[PDB]
Amino acid sequence: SKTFEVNIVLNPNLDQKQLAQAKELAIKALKQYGIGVEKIKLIGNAKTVEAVEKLKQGILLVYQIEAPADRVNDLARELRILDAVRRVETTYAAD
Template sequence: MRHYEVLFILKPTLTEEEVSAKLEFVKEILSKNGASIESVVEMGTRKLAYKIKKYERGTYFVIYFKAEPSLINELERVLRITEEVIRFLIVKYENKKEIAAWEKLSHGIKQTKKEIKPLESPEV
């Protein structure tokens, strides 16, 4: 099983009940397809960097999960056709450093600046 993170933004016009129903809907898709959900982070309603589908705000969620790669196509398909989702991003963590960062993020531990290394340019 691989380590993933899905961030999705819901329309700001949804009621609290509709927002929680959509969150449960996404979690249900993950669990029905054999994913193991590690944590769910509700980031709240925030201002978007730019308008998306005429919306200036959106309700953000991040779900950290472990799953087989075949699940990702189904998750993408469902998120694309769900009208309440205005944007989503799926991230796969591959190497040991990324997986260690995923472990910390999924347990709510923030990374220090020492742990985040800038990209080094190759020497010519």
């Protein structure tokens, strides 16, 4: 496994409860890849460029994770399973 970053974009019109639930569910997905919960960031007023096209802002939820390259596609898929989520992007990071 290598250092890896995932970026989840959520509808900014969601309740704090709904967002919290989406976060928990996202974690429950990630855990299935052996991913922990040690380094997590969220910006609740993020104006994601891929969101503001239709939305007001576009909430930026980020996990700093460790995963093999093979599971990158699977990570992206599961993170998109939610209705709260509008978009997921991925990238590799240095160790």
